[PDB]
Every structure is written in C-alpha cells, then in structure tokens.
Amino acid sequence: SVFSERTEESSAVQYFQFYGYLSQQQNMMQDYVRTGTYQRAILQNHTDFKDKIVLDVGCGSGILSFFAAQAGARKIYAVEASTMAQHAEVLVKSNNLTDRIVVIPGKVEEVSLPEQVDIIISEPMGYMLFNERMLESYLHAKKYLKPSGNMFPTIGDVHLAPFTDEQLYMEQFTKANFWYQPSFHGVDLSALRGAAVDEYFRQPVVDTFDIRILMAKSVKYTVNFLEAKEGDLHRIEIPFKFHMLHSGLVHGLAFWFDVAFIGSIMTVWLSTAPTEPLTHWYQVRCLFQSPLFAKAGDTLSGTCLLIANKRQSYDISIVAQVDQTGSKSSNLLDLKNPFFRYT
Amino acid sequence: SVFSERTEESSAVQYFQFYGYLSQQQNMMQDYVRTGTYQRAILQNHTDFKDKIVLDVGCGSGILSFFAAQAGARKIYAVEASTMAQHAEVLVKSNNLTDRIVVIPGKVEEVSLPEQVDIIISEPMGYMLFNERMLESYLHAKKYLKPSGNMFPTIGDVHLAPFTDEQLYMEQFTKANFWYQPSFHGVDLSALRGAAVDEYFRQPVVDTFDIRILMAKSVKYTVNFLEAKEGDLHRIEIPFKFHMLHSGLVHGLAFWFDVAFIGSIMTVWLSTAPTEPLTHWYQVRCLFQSPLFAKAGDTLSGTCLLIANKRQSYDISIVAQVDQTGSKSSNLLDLKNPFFRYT
Amino acid sequence: SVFSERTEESSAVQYFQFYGYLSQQQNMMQDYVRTGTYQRAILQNHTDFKDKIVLDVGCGSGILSFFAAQAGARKIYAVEASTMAQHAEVLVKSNNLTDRIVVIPGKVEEVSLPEQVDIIISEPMGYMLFNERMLESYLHAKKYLKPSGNMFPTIGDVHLAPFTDEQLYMEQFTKANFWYQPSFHGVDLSALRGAAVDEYFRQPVVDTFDIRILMAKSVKYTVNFLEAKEGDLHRIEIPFKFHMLHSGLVHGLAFWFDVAFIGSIMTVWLSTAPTEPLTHWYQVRCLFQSPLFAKAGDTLSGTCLLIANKRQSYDISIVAQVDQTGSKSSNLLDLKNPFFRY
Amino acid sequence: SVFSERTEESSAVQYFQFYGYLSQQQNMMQDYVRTGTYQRAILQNHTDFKDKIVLDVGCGSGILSFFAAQAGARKIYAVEASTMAQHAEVLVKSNNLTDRIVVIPGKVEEVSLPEQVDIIISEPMGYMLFNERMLESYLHAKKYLKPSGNMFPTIGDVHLAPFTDEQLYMEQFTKANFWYQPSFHGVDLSALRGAAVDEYFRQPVVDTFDIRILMAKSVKYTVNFLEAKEGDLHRIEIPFKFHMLHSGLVHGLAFWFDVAFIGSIMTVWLSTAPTEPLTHWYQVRCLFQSPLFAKAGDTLSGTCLLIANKRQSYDISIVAQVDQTGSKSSNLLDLKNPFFRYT
Ligand SMILES: Nc1ncnc2c1ncn2[C@@H]1O[C@H](CN(CC[C@H](N)C(=O)O)Cc2c[nH]cn2)[C@@H](O)[C@H]1O
Ligand SMILES: Nc1ncnc2c1ncn2[C@@H]1O[C@H](CN(CC[C@H](N)C(=O)O)Cc2c[nH]cn2)[C@@H](O)[C@H]1O
Ligand SMILES: Nc1ncnc2c1ncn2[C@@H]1O[C@H](CN(CC[C@H](N)C(=O)O)Cc2c[nH]cn2)[C@@H](O)[C@H]1O
Ligand SMILES: Nc1ncnc2c1ncn2[C@@H]1O[C@H](CN(CC[C@H](N)C(=O)O)Cc2c[nH]cn2)[C@@H](O)[C@H]1O
Fold first, then answer.
1. Which residues line ligand 1 at a C-beta cut-off of 6 Å?
2. Distance B38 CA to ligand 4 centre (A)
3. Is A148 in the same domain as A98?
4. What single string gives the DSSP state of each residue in C185-237?
5. Distance between CA atoms of D181 and B159, rounded to whole angstroms?
6. Helices marked H in chain D — which ranges?
7. Are the CB atoms for D241 and D299 separated by under 8 Å?
8. Is there a contact between D195 and C91 if contact means CB atoms under 8 Å apart?
9. Dist CA D119 CA A182 (whole Å)
10. Could you give the C-alpha distances from B333 to B176, B198, B220, B309, B314, in angstroms and in order?
11. Looking at the structure, do residues B221 and B243 belong to the same domain, yes or no?
C-alpha cells in the first residue's frame, strides 16, 4: 500500500498503538478549542452534510463522525487504523447510529469503501502542522472524493516568525554544556561537545510564549487540501522574507498554523496562533545554535525545507540570513525529538 | 538471534533510538546515586578489576567502562547496540584508552567477543527492576564469563509492600468519569466508561511517596545474577504474605528494588527504596481495582506474577486476599504503559 | 634595584602615574572602612607610636603618616615613589607637621633613610591581597626596621571558598560564544571559540556577592609580615581541602582577605569579607571553565598557586578535585586582566 | 622606525597589549554602526575592490579584509602589530582564503610589503578622531599606495560645537571640594583643592549627551586622507567661529567625528554625532576653565590646537572668546587621560 511504502513498520506499530489508548483520545477530546471548533464548522455548514456521504479519515473515538451525523449525513464511513476503531463501534451502537456511521477498521490507504463520498473530514494536523505525516493520508483519501466534493479542513496555513528569547537559548545551551566537562567522574566528555550542542539545538521547542518576543510580522505558507497531491508533502519548501520590526538577537523561528473549513454557508477557522487561546498543539520554536543580530528595517530571508522520512516525520533544514550583512544561520530540526517545555 | 526472537522489531527500533540520544545518556549519568554508586562499587573493589578482562553490557556513553579502567582493568569490551556506540568510541580515543577499551557495536546477543572475561558489568535495571527486559541481555552475556567469574551487580532484590492512598485511587475514577457523560458535544460517551477505568488501573504508577503510606514490612524477592538463567526472567512468580502493621484500606502494592555489588573487598548497595534519596527509577505502584480492608495483625497473602511480553515489558498479575476475612482482589497491569505521575 | 629587577619598565611607569592622580588618592581616602579602620588601628594603639620613629611605605597623600603623628610619633619618614609625594609635602606644611613628618620621594627599595625605625606602617594590599606586588615593597622595607620593631598591618589572611553562581558562569560563557558564530557578517569566527573561552575565563571577576553562594567554610592562608621575606611572595602555594556544606555545581573559588594590626593595646582587624561592609577591594572570583558537581559531605581538594610576574601581578593556577569522584579541574588565570563586574 | 621615534615604548607596549585581547576586538566588532557601515561602504563600492590589490592597516581580527574579499579583491595584505595577528591568520585559514589574504605581523611603519596597492582600508579612528595617533600609521601606509589609488575612509571630519551643561561643570567642584575640609579624619586637606580642580579640568569627558545642550551649529575640520601627509597630524590647528543659536553660559566644546568612504559607485558616511545612534566612540567634551556668556546671534571665536605627544595622544589647547563682549577663556587638556563619565 501507499502507507506501508512510505512508513517504517516500526514507526507505524508504535504510532497506532499510541492512538489506541482512551486516555489519549480523551486528551484530544478535552481540547475544547479543537473539538468545539470542529463541531461548529460542521454544524454551521450542515447543508454540506445533510443527506451526504462522508468519509472520516482517522476517526479515533468517532467524535467527528458524530458531528457529521448531527448535521444530517446520510452515511458516514469512519476509518481508523488503531484498535480505537473497536471503541468507536461501541459508541455508534450506544448512540443508536448504526444505520448512519459505519466504522471501517484499517488504514485509509488499504481499506475498501463501497462508494465515493461528497466530503472528507479529518483532524490530521500534528505539531507545526506536518508532524506525523497524517496529511498525506488525508490527501490520499481523495481517491474516494467525488469531483466537486469538499475537504474539511479545506486549507492549512503555516505561519513563521522570528523571535528573540535569550532565556530559552541559555536553557538549551546549559543542558548541552554538560558535554563540555573535562572530568565527569574523571572522564573527559568534551570531545562530544559539538555533537551535544547539535543534538539539543535540533529539538523543536513545543510550548507557548508571549507574542512580544516576535520580531517581525509572520510569513504564511498555504496548503490547499482540495488541490494538493500526496506526493507534494514529501518535499515542502517554505520561502520567507521578514521585515524586522525590532532590533536585536534573533534566536530562531516560531511556527504555528491555522486551518479553514470552507463550507457553503461559512468559513470557520481553527487557529493555533500565540494570539489565540491555547490548544494542545501549543506553538513550535526552532532555535539557532548561534543567534543572528538584526536591526529594525533589515530583512531576514531564507527557506524552511521539510523532507519526509520513513518515521512519519521530516528532516527539516532552516537557513536564514540577514540580507544586509550576510549573517547566515543553517540549522537542522529533528521533529522526532521535540522538547516539551510547557508546564 | 535470542534478542530478535524475544523482541518485536517495532519495539526494538524505538528502544535503541531512545538510547541513541546524548540527552538520555546524560539523564542517566546525572543520576548521582546511580552513577556515583557504580563508581564506588568498582573502585572500592579494585582487586575485582585490576589487570582483569571486563565486559560492559550496554555501555551507552562508556561511563562504566571508564570506571573499570580507573580500577585498573586490562581490557574492557564495551558492547552497545544504539548509535551511542559511535560516541563511546569518540570518548575512548579522546581519553587515550584505545589500548584497553574496545567498543563493539551491536546487541550482546549478536556480537562476538574475542575471549572470555573475568567480570561482567552492566546497568540493566528498569522500573520495578525488570522493565525493558535488559536483565535478560545481562544474563545472556554470561556465555562469555569464565567459570567463577563475577557479575556487577551480583544480585537484585525486588521489594513489594501494601500501601494506602485514597487520593491516588480516587484519581483513576476522576479521570475515567470523563467518559460518564451522556452529552459530550451531543455524544453519549458512557458506554466506554468501564473500558476507561480498566485502562487507567492497568497502568503502574511511577512516582515517589511518603513511607507512612506503607502498611506492612516489604517482602523481598531476590534474583542472583550469578546463578540465574535468562529464561528465569520470562515468568517471575512472587508469593507474598504481609503481616499488617496498620489498619486501613489497602489500595495496592508498592514496588522498589536494590542491587548489590558483591566484590572481594566489600559489598556495595544501590537502593531505590522510598527511604533513600530519589533516583530516576522513582518507585512503582500497582493499584487494586477493589481495595481491601485489613486490620493491624491481619495477614494479606497472594502472588504477583510477572509474564514477559515481546514489547520488552511484562504483563503483571496481582492477586491478594485478607486471610482473616477472605476478601479478595485480582488485578492485571501492563508495565509498558506506565503512568508517570511525579511532579 | 630590587624593584626594577622584578618590574617591567612599562608597568612601573603607568603604575606610579596612576597613583600620582589626586582623584585616585581621593577614591582610596573615601573608602571609610579602609581609612577609618587604619585610623582606629593607629590611634587605639597610640603607645606603639608615642615618641617613636615611623616609616610609612608608599604614603600617598600622607594620611597614615598624619595618623601616626596624631598618635604621638616623634619622626615619620613618609616614602612615596609617585609625584603624589609633592602633594603630601604640601599637606605636611599646611598642617604644621614639618617637625614630625618627613616626606622622602622615591621607591622604598632605593631611597636612603637616616636611621632605623620602630614601626612600619603601610597600605600595600591589592585585589586578592597580593595584586600589584606592593607587599614585597612592604617586606623589603624591613631592612630599616629595628630588631623587635612592629609592622602595621602585622598579618594578612587570604580566604578561599568554593561558590556556586550559574548566572555569572553563563554571563562569561555568553560573551565567549560570540566567537562561535559561523557567519558574523558572513565570516566564520568559530575556529577562535577555544581561544576566546580561554581568554575570558582567565579573567578574575571583581565584584561582590551574596554569602549564600558559598558552598563551604573558607580555607585561610596566613602571611606573617613580621617573619616573611620578600622572596616568599614570588611563589605562593596554597593547598586547600573543603568540606562541602551544600550539594551542587561549584563554578569556582571566591577570594577575600583580612589584615590585622596587632598592637600593644589591641588587635584591630580590617576585613574585606563578603560578610562585612563593602570596601574598594570588593571580593574576587576565579571561574572554572567547567563547573564541578559535588554533594554535601564531599571533599574538594587542591592547590592554588600564585606566581608573581614582571607586570606587578600574579599568574594564578587553581587545580581542584572532588575527592570522592575524581572529578578534576585545572585553571590558569591572569590577575592583570580582571573583569570589573560591579 | 617612524613609529618608535614618535612613540614612547611604555605607551606602545600597553597599546598593542590592549588590542591583542579578543574581548577588545569583539567590542569593536559588536559596534554594529561601525562594522556594518564599513561592510556597506566596501560591498556597495565593489568595483573599487574586484580584482584589486588591497592593504588593511591594523587588521585586528581581519574583519575588514574579509569584507574586501567579499567584494572580490584579488589580494589583500593585512598588517597587524599586536598578537591579534596570529588569530587573524587562523581565521584566514579557516575561511579558506589563504590564497587571497596574507597576514603580515608587525607595525605598518616597519614591515616589508612587496607591492603597491590599489586601495588602503583601515579603522584608525580614536576619541575625537585623532586619539591614539593611528591616523598617522594610516597616512604613512600611502608609501604603498599607487598614485591612482584610493583610501577607505577617504576623509575624516572632526566636529566641534559649544555646549551648556551646568551640572557637568559643577560636578568638577563637587569632586574637588572633597579636599576643602579642615578635618578629614583630623587632617586639613584644603591646600590641595586647587590642584584637584586643575586635575579634573584637564580631563576630556567621554560620554554622550542630549543635543539640546548644543548652542551652535558645529564647525567642521576636514582631513582628506588621500591628500594629507602624516606630518599634517602632528599639529592640528582648528580655528572656529560659532554663530550662537541659543543664549546662555558656554561651559566648553563638544567633539565628534564623521568619516566618508568616497567610492566609484557611492559615498558612504560613518557618523559618531550625538544626532546619530551611539557608537563606542561616544562623544568628547572639553570644559572651559570659566564659562562664557553668549547671546543668540553672538559669535564665539577662537582656536582648538591639538599638539601630538609621544604617549600616542594629544595635548588639547583651547582659546575662546565672545567677540561682542571680549569675555575670554581657555583650557589645556590631556587627551591621554580622559574621564569616562558614561553610565
Ligand atoms: N492512515 C490512517 N488510516 C486510518 N487512521 C489513521 C491513519 N493515520 C492516522 N490515523 C488515526 O487518526 C486519528 C487521529 N487523531 C484523532 C482524530 C479524531 N477524528 C478526532 O477528532 O478526535 C487526531 C490526530 C492526531 N495526530 C494528528 N491528528 C488517530 O486515531 C489515528 O490512529
Ligand atoms: N541487548 C543489548 N545489547 C547491547 N546494548 C544494549 C542492549 N540492551 C540495551 N542496551 C543498551 O544498554 C544501555 C543501558 N543504559 C545505559 C547504561 C550505561 N552503561 C550507563 O550506566 O550509563 C542503562 C539502562 C537503561 N535502561 C536500564 N538501564 C543503553 O545504552 C542501551 O542502548
Ligand atoms: N615601592 C614603592 N615605594 C614607594 N612608594 C610606593 C611603592 N609601591 C607603591 N607605592 C605607593 O604606595 C601608595 C599606595 N596607596 C596609597 C597608600 C596610603 N598610605 C594611604 O593609605 O592612603 C595604596 C595602595 C595601592 N595599592 C595597594 N595599596 C601609592 O601612592 C604608590 O605610589
Ligand atoms: N602602526 C600599526 N601597525 C600595525 N597595526 C596597528 C598599528 N597601529 C594600530 N594597529 C592595530 O590596528 C587595530 C585597530 N583596531 C581594529 C581594527 C580592525 N581593522 C577592525 O576594523 O575591526 C581599530 C581601532 C582601534 N582604535 C582605533 N581604531 C588594532 O588591532 C591595532 O593593534
């Protein structure tokens, strides 16, 4: 299948094991911004669901499929690869919806659906939008979408902005400085100093922050889920040019994302921006090993390149330079090893 | 190999990826009780090392092998299956010890050593001693131990004791009762409440506690690493009879462990008991789904059965009864999904 | 002379020029702990001065010689190598003390005095007690001291103690990390990071601190100015063994000093300890390039080696180890390039 | 040499020791106005560098030679007298520029260079432009300049303007009056008060200030580095006539400087004026011994005579008079002993 060809079996097993726990579905369900906004998108666009055929990609507990059923969907195929599929089946029965929600266990890349659908619904967003590579499954599922069918969410916007945060920088450098020791219990560790700095600075920082740390207006990169192909997400190139609003040290780039549900009645937005109420996605920051100095009015330009790997994640390179001075930073990000800093 | 035959590939890949991070090695190295006690055990028993041949099973950074070299070992074979082997090799060279420490990349079940050794050293302990199943690799390695050779650690003592903790117990229902609502965004979740209760109670609780919650003197189960065979750890039956020192409700069993380094000069102990300073192992509690009343002077008897699984962990079965009343509790736990509660 | 042979001409010139400024003499005079304690030492031991012959080594403005005169000295030779000597003479005349204070311009190693003295007074202390090497001039001056004469100050105690201060450490590490940049205006500086770390960590830090940063009781090293020879200060070896009172990272050693005026009536102490009011000497901290972890109850052992150099300062060597773990640190510092942090 | 004959050895030793510190090179490098403007001057005038032969007088870290290299210079001779030369060599090697930058340790007055150059670059400016007397080394280096050559910077403008600052003036007496007491610990200090006043007034004050203290447009004295001889800087007679824009007491003269890089493409200015962001040069103020009253519309005329001395600095002689009233004042100041007042 397309999934197994792009996914290490080792990664896939642990991945779907993780989502088979009720505690994990609960954590997601209790993100009220997430769950409430999905419900609003669907119910406020009920005419996009009434008497329609729906596919829920990765249904989990089934919660989005219940929302499609509240909106009057005639038939909802709820596909789920983890053992959570069996818990969804239980809720479909106890909610008396056996004639409308059909749970189909397995990967959306591998199952058979009896018919084409009017609309696909999913929550495939990970950290920094792309983590976990579930958007590829979402796009793959379009083989079941009628021409002129819709996608909920319809588009995804990644936002990037430079930040200054000396304390965060020093926190990570302090941990790395362990490997500078020339006599840890009599052992010289210092030859690994470089490897340790590299490793810690490869960790995306997952937490929230005050918007006053942002040094320029964000740049937006848009993915249109109606148009994009699965293969497009194997290589994601995000160019940026920031007009610096403040002078200082740029310690890295901050990332967040919005998705829009573009329905017939209205467009509903789900935002994970630092200006919005907190979600379980928080925000994500890359750090530079060496911060870049820039003054207000300078431009900071470069690219964030995401190259998909077999662990349902990405090898990320961020290159940024202050155009006026040629001060450049090249960085790697290991999205598989995030630092969850939030308390 | 013996390792690949007892381990699901998916579990093995994530396991060794975890130990390939310098930050994870650092976390273990920075446990001063752990690292300092190993150094003391080895240095204070220098005649067990001076001019000896040593095997370090799972050398990680190489730290124990360096301690062996400090104690005067002639040759140390330092085996490591993660990519951390490459970093250990860098430290061996940078510490000018290439003539005495040989880093061998690979699983100790799969590599070849060029000769037999006098002593095996390792830090293979997990939560409640046995988690991760690395003790089997440690025992497996005795195929390379000379007759009358030694093992450091030499023995491992698992301790179990009944505890009372009403707040920890009640916490499981607080969490599970998320599912006991008839209209979560219009969805009746209540049919999954039982499954959620079961899932939470199947999680051993990793954290520390006040020793005043303990209701009887612990029972000790000893594994002698000199005598034990790898297969001995596939099924571990721990009978217990507690003589209750306090009256109250017993909510479960608390677990901790000690290891002893039985050298020619002295025996050194490493303890993770709740009466000792905290280590990265904390302590582990397994709840009974139904608590038992016992009075001081009553006896609480039963068995803890640990059955190894191919996810490098154990299925735990605990059955307990208050002999004087016949009140009984039976519980099943999954050590691969611990709940990390410590704050 | 003994002074010129141990001293680089470049250093001596700038050194005595510095002390030729009235603004600099004023700054020292305005250290009330210093000036007030010297006056108490001398006046409360007035019998060590009454009708005595006194030598003031490096008299500056003359202030200590005036204290000696207040205490009843018969004749005070006030030796001063900088042009401040001429200002001291102006004050001796305007204070009508020409019959008692004789200003002698020049280095104490080179001038001639008409007679031997009963007691020598001086303020020769620098940062970390020994900086500027003026204690050698003070000891040299004992060639003019009658047998059994006294010295004010009489003894000097150097104190050393381990400290923890993560922010200071990272402050210095931060400055050095400038030289880690692979693209400073397009230029790769990183090959100099090592050299930069070495340079910054060679700077003793001059400022004060909270006493709660100290991780063990101080070790004391005593110089008895009555017994010591000038040559004793060329290489000063201070062994130490600290009994750690707290667990944590040791970022370096803190230094301060006391001097005692052991007079016939009473002993008066001038202390620059962090438990005492601040003086112009502050305290001094020598950072380790990498902190040492230790637990309460551990012992931190080693040696502090102070080697006098030809720029009137010291090359500092600190080697320390946590005995229980073998964790060892070696450091070299240049007291001629301090970081004034206060 | 020309350097040793104009410089006291004690001064030269301390001077080059000072610049052998990386911390001192860093301080200059981190002056963004300074470093960024040199870079801009050089890169935006790239036709003045491409395939050219360049001499960097007093190269320090080598930073300006790397800018010359960024602009396409074919060969750069980088002369440095302090031990910083050895660090510049390291950077040249590590930046793979050994074929284009040659580091020549020593004084530009004393070393041998093999060929004539198209352009000399340097940063030889001190406080009040002339302090440290490095501009003479810069001009001396024109013995290596082709007749059709250029100098970067090309011209230097010293600016002088009258100021009113009652608090600065009074401060000298507040400090000197320490000595005006009859019983400082029993000692009459009063006889030294005049000497103390004299000493404070001989020190130029290095700090910045609000431009509103300035009472007239500055008078500009220009040194054209392309045309000037090093001997032109041994005695610098700066006449001035200020047209007073404000009425009040004139307490002295404020000094700052600009330099211009007059290239083929454009002229780039580096300014240390109090109307511009602060640099590590700040500004300099020389007090009059007695303030002068002047009305808006009056003319304040006189001369500032800078007499080079062998301590790599200048004796500053200022005579000033209000023409309409004949009120006159002077001062004699020692630029080698400035008072750093800035907080
Ligand atoms: N190829 C695949 N075929 C089938 N199923 C898949 C596939 N890939 C992933 N999954 C499943 O999607 C689920 C995603 N998570 C729950 C979504 C649910 N609709 C809700 O809103 O609560 C959200 C989520 C988590 N991280 C990102 N989104 C999770 O149960 C996975 O096992
Ligand atoms: N069959 C195997 N063959 C080879 N190597 C293996 C195998 N199995 C596991 N490993 C490796 O052992 C290491 C265990 N951890 C580090 C120990 C190090 N000596 C120290 O004391 O710091 C401790 C530890 C972790 N969990 C419990 N103890 C870890 O680097 C694993 O990748
Ligand atoms: N070999 C020397 N021969 C002659 N004079 C010397 C010599 N060496 C140094 N000096 C002079 O001593 C003075 C030291 N300072 C002033 C002391 C004064 N008694 C007071 O208490 O105010 C304090 C001080 C400075 N550093 C430490 N203490 C200073 O004026 C020097 O020029
Ligand atoms: N006769 C001389 N022969 C050789 N070299 C000399 C001579 N005289 C001084 N120097 C050296 O010039 C350097 C001047 N400073 C650094 C300049 C560097 N190009 C930069 O822009 O960052 C700037 C500066 C400081 N003060 C004014 N400009 C300093 O390293 C001196 O040791």
1. A 3, 16, 19, 28, 58-61, 63-64, 79-82, 84, 107-109, 123-126, 132, 134, 137
2. 55
3. yes
4. TTB--GGGHHHHHHHHHTS-EEE---GGGB-SPPEEEEEETTT--GGGGSEEE
5. 81
6. 2-6, 9-19, 22-29, 32-44, 63-70, 84-94, 134-140, 166-176, 193-201
7. yes
8. no
9. 47
10. 16, 9, 20, 12, 8
11. yes
Catalytic residue among B56, B132, B157, B298: B132
- Find chain D residues with C-beta within 8 A of C62's C-beta: 187
Residues paired with residue D241 on neighbouring β-strands, in sequence order: D301
Beta strands A339-340; A205-207: pairing state: parallel
Give the H/E segment covering residue D162.
strand D155-163
Distances in whole angstroms, Cα of residue A145 to Cα of each of A122, A124, A138, D339: 13, 17, 11, 79
Residue D321 carries which side chain, given as an amino acid letter? Q
Instruction: Examine the domain organization and report whether D176 and D190 are in the same domain.
Output: yes
Note whether A55 and A27 are within 8 A (CB).
Answer: no
Give pairs for C177-181: CB < 8 Å, separation 24+.
Answer: C177/A173, C177/A290, C178/D26, C178/D29, C178/D30, C179/D22, C179/D26, C180/A289, C180/A290, C181/A290, C181/A327
Q: What angle do CA A25, A30, A35 make, to 5 degrees?
A: 90
Residues C135 and C268 in one domain: no
Domain that includes residue A13, residue range:
1-153
Beta carbons within 10 angstroms of residue C337's beta carbon: 15
CA–CA distance, A176 with D335 (Å, rounded to integer)? 47
Q: Rounded to an integer, what distance in angstroms lies between the CA atom of residue D25 and that of residue D34?
A: 12
Q: Which residues in C3-113 belong to E strands, given as ranges?
A: 53-57, 75-80, 101-105
Say if residue A312 is in the same domain as residue A185. yes
For B38, B197, D313, the CA distances from B174, given in Å and listed in that order, are: 42, 9, 80
Alpha helices in A148-188 (DSSP H): 166-176
Q: Which two tokens stand for residue D290?
A: 């007695």
Query: How far apart, in Å, do the first and last CA atoms of chain B sit?
Result: 40
Question: What is the identity of the amino acid at D157?
Answer: D
Q: Compute the distance between CA of residue C208 and CA of residue C276 in angstroms, rounded to an integer.
A: 11
DSSP, collapsed to helix, strand or coil, labels residue A68 as helix
Q: How far apart are CA A125 and CA A259, in angstroms?
A: 9
Ranges assigned E (strand) in chain B: 53-57, 75-80, 101-105, 117-122, 145-152, 155-163, 205-207, 219-224, 235-243, 248-262, 267-271, 283-294, 299-309, 313-322, 328-334, 339-340
Using CB atoms within 10 Å of the CB of residue C319, give its burial: 0 to 12 exposed, 13 to 18 middle, 19+ buried. Answer: middle
**Based on the domain organization, do D114 and D172 belong to the same domain?**
no
A133 CA: distance to closest CA in chain B (Å): 18
Q: Do D119 and D147 contact (CB within 8 A), yes or no? A: no
Over the Cα atoms of chain C, what is R_g? Answer: 22
Interface touch A186/C329, C-beta < 8 Å: no
Instruction: Please tell me whether residues A125 and A82 are part of one structural domain.
Output: yes
Q: Please tell me whether residue A162 adopts helix, strand or coil conformation.
A: strand
Tell me the nearest-neighbour CA distance from A220 into chain D, angstroms.
Answer: 30
State how many domains chain C has: 2
E-strand stretches of B10-58: 53-57
Rounded Cα distance between C205 and C173, Å, is: 13
Contacts of D39 in chain A (CB under 8 A): 325
Number of other CB atoms surrounding residue C236 within 10 Å: 18
* A92 and A147 fall within a common domain: yes
User: Obtained via which technique?
Assistant: X-ray
CB D222 within 8 A of CB D159: no
Whether the CB-CB separation of C174 and C308 falls below 8 Å is answered with: no
Contact criterion met (CB below 8 Å) for C195 and C179:
yes
Distance from C-alpha of B149 to C-alpha of B145, rounded to nearest angstrom? 6
C253 close to C163: Cβ distance less than 8 angstroms: yes
* Cα atoms in the Cβ-side hemisphere of radius 13 Å centred on D206: 17
What's the CATH number where B237 sits?
2.70.160.11
Q: Which of B231, B229, B276, B237 is nearest to B257 (CA)?
A: B276
Taking a C-beta distance cutoff of 8 angstroms, is the pair D251, D165 a contact?
yes
